[PDB]
Design an enzyme around this catalytic site. Structure first.
Site, PDB file in Angstrom:
ATOM      1  N   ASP A 104       9.872  18.775  10.447  1.00 53.23           N
ATOM      2  CA  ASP A 104      10.814  18.198  11.382  1.00 53.23           C
ATOM      3  C   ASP A 104      11.535  19.334  12.101  1.00 53.23           C
ATOM      4  O   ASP A 104      10.856  20.200  12.669  1.00 53.23           O
ATOM      5  CB  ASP A 104      11.720  17.193  10.676  1.00 53.23           C
ATOM      6  CG  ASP A 104      12.680  16.493  11.639  1.00 53.23           C
ATOM      7  OD1 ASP A 104      12.220  15.645  12.427  1.00 53.23           O
ATOM      8  OD2 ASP A 104      13.870  16.835  11.616  1.00 53.23           O
ATOM      9  N   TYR A 234      20.951  19.321  17.424  1.00 51.87           N
ATOM     10  CA  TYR A 234      20.586  18.580  18.629  1.00 51.87           C
ATOM     11  C   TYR A 234      21.498  18.906  19.812  1.00 51.87           C
ATOM     12  O   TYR A 234      21.049  18.924  20.962  1.00 51.87           O
ATOM     13  CB  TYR A 234      20.605  17.088  18.321  1.00 51.87           C
ATOM     14  CG  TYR A 234      19.387  16.634  17.572  1.00 51.87           C
ATOM     15  CD1 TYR A 234      18.193  16.452  18.237  1.00 51.87           C
ATOM     16  CD2 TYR A 234      19.407  16.409  16.201  1.00 51.87           C
ATOM     17  CE1 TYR A 234      17.052  16.063  17.574  1.00 51.87           C
ATOM     18  CE2 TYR A 234      18.256  16.024  15.519  1.00 51.87           C
ATOM     19  CZ  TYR A 234      17.100  15.844  16.220  1.00 51.87           C
ATOM     20  OH  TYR A 234      15.944  15.443  15.613  1.00 51.87           O
ATOM     21  N   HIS A 299       7.528   9.134   8.714  1.00 53.44           N
ATOM     22  CA  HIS A 299       8.060  10.478   9.020  1.00 53.44           C
ATOM     23  C   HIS A 299       8.237  11.408   7.813  1.00 53.44           C
ATOM     24  O   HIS A 299       7.964  12.594   7.907  1.00 53.44           O
ATOM     25  CB  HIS A 299       9.385  10.352   9.776  1.00 53.44           C
ATOM     26  CG  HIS A 299      10.041  11.655  10.083  1.00 53.44           C
ATOM     27  ND1 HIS A 299       9.637  12.471  11.117  1.00 53.44           N
ATOM     28  CD2 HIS A 299      11.103  12.272   9.512  1.00 53.44           C
ATOM     29  CE1 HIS A 299      10.418  13.535  11.168  1.00 53.44           C
ATOM     30  NE2 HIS A 299      11.313  13.441  10.201  1.00 53.44           N
TER      31      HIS A 299
END
Length: 320
Positions: A104, A234, A299
């Site tokens: 990730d 982010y 995921h």
């Protein structure tokens, strides 16, 4: 015998490291919003087979301290690769090159490690996040906003305070349970005021891989730290785009294996499958071996399909 935990001074942080086994080093780099703990099954499997497994809590996560929560600019990809290089210098002093396994946002970090310092990495196993060829027209936040709109998780994470305020009345445990058990190929949406209501639930039996004790491990850590450190990764994406302009056209030259779950939302970003399977990926990553897609998985593959992931890592690194 048991997993050993230590604190190591690195790049201005006090970094928490978990470690198991003796032998050649494998550095494991976790994703969002996870911890060293996401590698629990792989650490055991590879340690039993003669490797030294090391897994830190990254900047802003778990028991790693020192990054200023109020300044996302300190969570840039340059800061993050800096952390990793410093970590390797501190803990793998007599191994010029180590194996790296990542997932990730960890895989995002690992790709840039291999670009900036290929001299440090012997071989790479990346999970979920494929190499992203820098788009010279716009940063990734703007790209994903153009496709999915303002409620898309990447967009909603941008303004400091907002997603934190959304999560506050819900509690860390419910947030993590919802994210960890998610299985739909659409991206996450967090419309303002709606909490977790825009996130569909899969049948409960499909999350039997996550015990209540395991969920509690994550929830307890995030209750204490909050989500700001993790979300700041982010918030740094726009500056990351600017800072990586020097590597336009550069290839990753480290031997690499990539693995992704059939239902992983990142795998369904428009253009990703094409890039991955039809040549683009292999052009940027010339020593990329055959891509692995795990049928029926989503995921969090290290936890959902631990044996398959552990064995794929072992079989790859044994080639070296």
């Amino acid at each position: 015998k048991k997993i050993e935990h230590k604190m190591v001074a690195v790049n201005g942080l006090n970094m928490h490291l978990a470690e198991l086994g003796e032998g050649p080093t494998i550095l494991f780099i976790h994703g969002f919003p996870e911890l060293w703990y996401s590698w629990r099954h792989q650490m055991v499997y590879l340690a039993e087979r003669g490797y030294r497994a090391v897994a830190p809590d990254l900047r802003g996560y778990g028991d790693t301290t020192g990054a200023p929560l109020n300044d996302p600019s300190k969570f840039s990809i340059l800061h993050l690769v800096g952390d990793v290089v410093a970590l390797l210098e501190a803990i793998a002093l007599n191994e010029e090159k180590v194996f790296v396994v990542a997932h990730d946002l960890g895989a995002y970090i690992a790709w840039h490690l291999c670009l900036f310092r290929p001299d440090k990495v012997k071989a790479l196993v990346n999970l979920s996040v494929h190499f992203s060829k820098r788009n010279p027209k716009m940063n990734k936040v703007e790209g994903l906003k153009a496709i999915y709109g303002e409620d898309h998780y990447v967009s909603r994470f941008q303004v400091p305070g907002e997603i934190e305020a959304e999560f506050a009345p819900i509690g860390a445990k419910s947030v993590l349970k919802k994210i960890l058990t998610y299985r739909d190929p659409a991206p996450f949406y967090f419309p303002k005021g709606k909490g977790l209501e825009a996130i569909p639930d899969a049948p409960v039996a499909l999350s039997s891989w996550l015990s209540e004790e395991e969920l509690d491990y994550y929830a307890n850590k995030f209750e204490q730290t909050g989500f700001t450190g993790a979300v700041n990764y982010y918030r740094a994406l726009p500056i990351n785009w600017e800072l990586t302009a020097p590597w336009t056209g550069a290839q990753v030259k480290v031997p690499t294996k990539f693995i992704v779950g059939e239902f992983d939302l990142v795998y369904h970003i428009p253009g990703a499958k094409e890039y991955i399977h039809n040549g683009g990926f292999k052009k940027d990553v010339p020593l990329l071996e055959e891509v692995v897609v795990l049928e029926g998985a989503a995921h969090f593959v290290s936890q959902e399909r631990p044996h398959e992931i552990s064995k794929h890592i072992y079989d790859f690194i044994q080639k070296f």
